Motif scaffolding. Structure first.
Motif, PDB file in Angstrom:
ATOM      1  N   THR A  77      -4.687  11.064   5.239  1.00 48.44           N
ATOM      2  CA  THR A  77      -3.891   9.947   4.755  1.00 48.44           C
ATOM      3  C   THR A  77      -2.786   9.524   5.711  1.00 48.44           C
ATOM      4  OG1 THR A  77      -4.253  10.853   2.528  1.00 48.44           O
ATOM      5  CG2 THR A  77      -2.754   8.999   2.745  1.00 48.44           C
ATOM      6  N   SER A  78      -2.750   8.233   6.019  1.00 50.28           N
ATOM      7  CA  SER A  78      -1.728   7.679   6.894  1.00 50.28           C
ATOM      8  C   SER A  78      -0.568   7.185   6.024  1.00 50.28           C
ATOM      9  CB  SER A  78      -2.299   6.508   7.675  1.00 50.28           C
ATOM     10  OG  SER A  78      -2.618   5.454   6.799  1.00 50.28           O
ATOM     11  N   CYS A  79       0.565   6.910   6.659  1.00 44.53           N
ATOM     12  CA  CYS A  79       1.745   6.419   5.953  1.00 44.53           C
ATOM     13  C   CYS A  79       1.416   5.114   5.213  1.00 44.53           C
ATOM     14  CB  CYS A  79       2.876   6.153   6.947  1.00 44.53           C
ATOM     15  SG  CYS A  79       3.228   7.483   8.133  1.00 44.53           S
ATOM     16  N   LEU A  80       0.817   4.165   5.926  1.00 40.57           N
ATOM     17  CA  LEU A  80       0.474   2.866   5.341  1.00 40.57           C
ATOM     18  C   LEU A  80      -0.607   2.938   4.262  1.00 40.57           C
ATOM     19  CD1 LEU A  80       1.753   0.016   6.275  1.00 40.57           C
ATOM     20  CD2 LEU A  80       2.381   2.083   7.560  1.00 40.57           C
ATOM     21  N   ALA A  81      -1.586   3.820   4.444  1.00 44.21           N
ATOM     22  CA  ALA A  81      -2.647   3.964   3.454  1.00 44.21           C
ATOM     23  C   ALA A  81      -2.068   4.368   2.101  1.00 44.21           C
ATOM     24  CB  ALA A  81      -3.658   4.980   3.909  1.00 44.21           C
ATOM     25  N   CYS A  82      -1.182   5.356   2.095  1.00 39.01           N
ATOM     26  CA  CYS A  82      -0.589   5.793   0.843  1.00 39.01           C
ATOM     27  C   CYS A  82       0.408   4.786   0.312  1.00 39.01           C
ATOM     28  CB  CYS A  82       0.080   7.154   0.968  1.00 39.01           C
ATOM     29  SG  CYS A  82       0.755   7.715  -0.624  1.00 39.01           S
ATOM     30  N   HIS A  83       1.229   4.230   1.195  1.00 39.63           N
ATOM     31  CA  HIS A  83       2.221   3.248   0.781  1.00 39.63           C
ATOM     32  C   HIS A  83       1.604   2.009   0.140  1.00 39.63           C
ATOM     33  CE1 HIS A  83       5.988   4.810   3.082  1.00 39.63           C
ATOM     34  NE2 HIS A  83       5.462   5.738   2.307  1.00 39.63           N
ATOM     35  N   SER A  84       0.417   1.611   0.590  1.00 35.71           N
ATOM     36  CA  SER A  84      -0.262   0.457  -0.004  1.00 35.71           C
ATOM     37  C   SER A  84      -0.529   0.728  -1.479  1.00 35.71           C
ATOM     38  CB  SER A  84      -1.572   0.201   0.710  1.00 35.71           C
ATOM     39  OG  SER A  84      -1.310  -0.277   2.011  1.00 35.71           O
ATOM     40  N   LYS A  85      -0.981   1.941  -1.766  1.00 36.90           N
ATOM     41  CA  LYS A  85      -1.285   2.340  -3.132  1.00 36.90           C
ATOM     42  C   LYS A  85      -0.035   2.428  -3.993  1.00 36.90           C
ATOM     43  CE  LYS A  85      -5.375   4.976  -1.767  1.00 36.90           C
ATOM     44  NZ  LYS A  85      -5.832   6.338  -1.379  1.00 36.90           N
ATOM     45  N   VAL A  86       1.050   2.949  -3.414  1.00 35.60           N
ATOM     46  CA  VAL A  86       2.317   3.060  -4.130  1.00 35.60           C
ATOM     47  C   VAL A  86       2.806   1.649  -4.430  1.00 35.60           C
ATOM     48  CG1 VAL A  86       4.741   3.738  -4.053  1.00 35.60           C
ATOM     49  CG2 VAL A  86       3.011   5.243  -3.078  1.00 35.60           C
ATOM     50  N   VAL A  87       2.712   0.772  -3.441  1.00 39.04           N
ATOM     51  CA  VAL A  87       3.137  -0.609  -3.592  1.00 39.04           C
ATOM     52  C   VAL A  87       2.291  -1.366  -4.607  1.00 39.04           C
ATOM     53  CG1 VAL A  87       3.125  -2.816  -2.395  1.00 39.04           C
ATOM     54  CG2 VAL A  87       4.415  -0.903  -1.495  1.00 39.04           C
ATOM     55  N   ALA A  88       1.017  -1.017  -4.724  1.00 39.25           N
ATOM     56  CA  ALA A  88       0.166  -1.675  -5.710  1.00 39.25           C
ATOM     57  C   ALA A  88       0.715  -1.424  -7.131  1.00 39.25           C
ATOM     58  CB  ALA A  88      -1.257  -1.160  -5.594  1.00 39.25           C
ATOM     59  N   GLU A  89       1.232  -0.221  -7.354  1.00 36.46           N
ATOM     60  CA  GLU A  89       1.783   0.188  -8.644  1.00 36.46           C
ATOM     61  C   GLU A  89       3.257  -0.167  -8.819  1.00 36.46           C
ATOM     62  OE1 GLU A  89       0.855   4.359  -8.774  1.00 36.46           O
ATOM     63  OE2 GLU A  89      -1.319   3.942  -8.832  1.00 36.46           O
ATOM     64  N   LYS A  90       3.976  -0.259  -7.707  1.00 33.59           N
ATOM     65  CA  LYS A  90       5.393  -0.598  -7.713  1.00 33.59           C
ATOM     66  C   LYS A  90       5.583  -1.721  -6.681  1.00 33.59           C
ATOM     67  CE  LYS A  90       8.304   2.714  -8.623  1.00 33.59           C
ATOM     68  NZ  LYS A  90       9.138   3.949  -8.498  1.00 33.59           N
ATOM     69  N   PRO A  91       5.122  -2.942  -7.023  1.00 31.34           N
ATOM     70  CA  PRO A  91       5.219  -4.115  -6.144  1.00 31.34           C
ATOM     71  C   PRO A  91       6.605  -4.457  -5.635  1.00 31.34           C
ATOM     72  CG  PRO A  91       4.748  -4.758  -8.376  1.00 31.34           C
ATOM     73  CD  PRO A  91       4.470  -3.301  -8.290  1.00 31.34           C
ATOM     74  N   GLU A  92       7.636  -4.027  -6.360  1.00 30.32           N
ATOM     75  CA  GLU A  92       9.014  -4.274  -5.963  1.00 30.32           C
ATOM     76  C   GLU A  92       9.373  -3.512  -4.690  1.00 30.32           C
ATOM     77  OE1 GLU A  92       9.287  -0.673  -8.759  1.00 30.32           O
ATOM     78  OE2 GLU A  92       8.148  -2.543  -8.748  1.00 30.32           O
ATOM     79  N   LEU A  93       8.500  -2.604  -4.259  1.00 30.65           N
ATOM     80  CA  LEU A  93       8.744  -1.810  -3.049  1.00 30.65           C
ATOM     81  C   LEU A  93       7.876  -2.238  -1.856  1.00 30.65           C
ATOM     82  CD1 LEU A  93       8.824   1.779  -4.723  1.00 30.65           C
ATOM     83  CD2 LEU A  93      10.808   0.512  -3.915  1.00 30.65           C
ATOM     84  N   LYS A  94       7.205  -3.381  -1.983  1.00 30.95           N
ATOM     85  CA  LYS A  94       6.328  -3.904  -0.931  1.00 30.95           C
ATOM     86  C   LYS A  94       7.004  -3.991   0.440  1.00 30.95           C
ATOM     87  CE  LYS A  94       3.352  -7.915   0.214  1.00 30.95           C
ATOM     88  NZ  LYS A  94       2.075  -7.140   0.345  1.00 30.95           N
ATOM     89  N   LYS A  95       8.142  -4.672   0.504  1.00 33.88           N
ATOM     90  CA  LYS A  95       8.879  -4.818   1.757  1.00 33.88           C
ATOM     91  C   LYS A  95       9.370  -3.463   2.284  1.00 33.88           C
ATOM     92  CE  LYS A  95      11.160  -7.656   4.641  1.00 33.88           C
ATOM     93  NZ  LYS A  95      10.463  -8.404   5.741  1.00 33.88           N
ATOM     94  N   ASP A  96       9.960  -2.667   1.397  1.00 34.64           N
ATOM     95  CA  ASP A  96      10.495  -1.367   1.779  1.00 34.64           C
ATOM     96  C   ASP A  96       9.491  -0.404   2.397  1.00 34.64           C
ATOM     97  OD1 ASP A  96      13.029  -2.149   0.925  1.00 34.64           O
ATOM     98  OD2 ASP A  96      12.993  -0.916  -0.892  1.00 34.64           O
ATOM     99  N   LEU A  97       8.325  -0.293   1.770  1.00 32.98           N
ATOM    100  CA  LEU A  97       7.291   0.643   2.201  1.00 32.98           C
ATOM    101  C   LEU A  97       6.210   0.139   3.145  1.00 32.98           C
ATOM    102  CD1 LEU A  97       6.651   2.862  -0.969  1.00 32.98           C
ATOM    103  CD2 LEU A  97       8.569   2.831   0.611  1.00 32.98           C
ATOM    104  N   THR A  98       5.994  -1.166   3.208  1.00 37.89           N
ATOM    105  CA  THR A  98       4.949  -1.656   4.091  1.00 37.89           C
ATOM    106  C   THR A  98       5.368  -2.723   5.111  1.00 37.89           C
ATOM    107  OG1 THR A  98       4.135  -3.236   2.436  1.00 37.89           O
ATOM    108  CG2 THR A  98       3.162  -1.018   2.419  1.00 37.89           C
ATOM    109  N   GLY A  99       6.626  -3.162   5.056  1.00 35.81           N
ATOM    110  CA  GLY A  99       7.090  -4.178   5.983  1.00 35.81           C
ATOM    111  C   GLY A  99       7.150  -3.792   7.453  1.00 35.81           C
ATOM    112  N   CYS A 100       6.755  -4.718   8.320  1.00 33.11           N
ATOM    113  CA  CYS A 100       6.796  -4.478   9.755  1.00 33.11           C
ATOM    114  C   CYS A 100       8.222  -4.660  10.273  1.00 33.11           C
ATOM    115  CB  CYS A 100       5.845  -5.429  10.471  1.00 33.11           C
ATOM    116  SG  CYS A 100       4.148  -5.313   9.873  1.00 33.11           S
TER     117      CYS A 100
END
Ligand code: HEC
Ligand code: HEC
Ligand code: HEC
Ligand code: HEC
Length: 107
Positions: A77-100
């Motif tokens: 598991t990569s950082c982005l792979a897991c973060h995508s899933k977390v963000v799917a469930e907690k969309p309010e964290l999209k920028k925080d966890l997956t932003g470039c």
């Protein structure tokens, strides 16, 4: 195993350094990130010599960039792979966890 670091640690790329915080990952098993190598436990730095030591290439198993940012099908598991899933469930964290940019990884 060694004690998990209690302060953010440095994840050095070839140009950028991203700080990795263990606390928010207290519920994630160590082995998810510090995966087994040759059937043995290892907590060595991801970019260690003989590991993900290609700090400039964008792809390849030796690419630290790839093991960190790939959303593709990986052996671990990569950082982005897991973060995508977390963000799917907690969309309010999209920028925080997956932003470039302006994310928690790249402020
Ligand atoms: C949006 C999808 C993102 C883009 C595009 C980039 N990142 Fe990251 N990033 C993270 C770490 C742990 C590092 C250091 C280790 C490494 O990959 O070498 C980086 C580094 C970069 C770099 C520079 C690479 C280098 O110095 O050799 C680029 C150009 C880059 N990132 C683009 C971690 C994360 C992260 C935390 C989970 C997020 C959300 C992003 N990066 C997002 C992007
Ligand atoms: C992924 C979300 C991780 C989890 C879960 C755990 N660790 Fe971690 N650890 C991770 C990274 C990206 C780093 C930085 C490595 C680098 O490239 O610099 C670390 C670092 C450590 C270290 C220090 C090793 C070093 O970098 O010199 C130790 C001792 C460590 N991690 C221990 C550890 C333990 C025991 C865990 C479970 C309780 C654990 N980590 C989880 C990523 C991740
Ligand atoms: C050398 C001792 C290593 C250390 C330390 C880390 N990784 Fe690794 N990783 C290594 C190998 C030999 C391989 C190939 C597959 C295998 O398990 O033998 C991998 C693979 C990964 C992958 C999948 C990559 C793919 O192309 O499918 C990822 C996502 C990955 N490694 C991540 C990773 C992280 C974040 C590490 C630091 C906490 C880490 N690895 C350490 C060898 C080594
Ligand atoms: C799932 C198995 C994960 C992996 C692999 C990685 N991260 Fe993570 N991360 C995860 C969770 C559950 C959370 C918390 C979300 C919440 O509900 O609040 C996080 C959080 C982070 C953060 C943000 C912390 C903050 O400042 O608020 C960062 C900066 C972070 N994660 C970094 C990071 C990196 C670089 C990883 C690869 C080495 C990585 N995470 C993997 C879940 C998972």
């Amino acid at each position: 195993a060694p004690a998990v670091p209690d302060k953010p640690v440095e994840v050095k790329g070839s140009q950028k350094t991203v700080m990795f915080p263990h606390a928010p990952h207290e519920k994630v098993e160590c082995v998810t990130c510090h995966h087994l190598v040759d059937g043995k436990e290892s907590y060595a730095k991801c970019g260690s010599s003989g590991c993900h030591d290609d700090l400039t290439a964008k792809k390849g198993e030796k690419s630290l960039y790839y093991v960190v940012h790939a959303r593709g099908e990986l052996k671990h598991t990569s950082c982005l792979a897991c973060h995508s899933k977390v963000v799917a469930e907690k969309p309010e964290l999209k920028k925080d966890l997956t932003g470039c940019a302006k994310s928690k990884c790249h402020p």
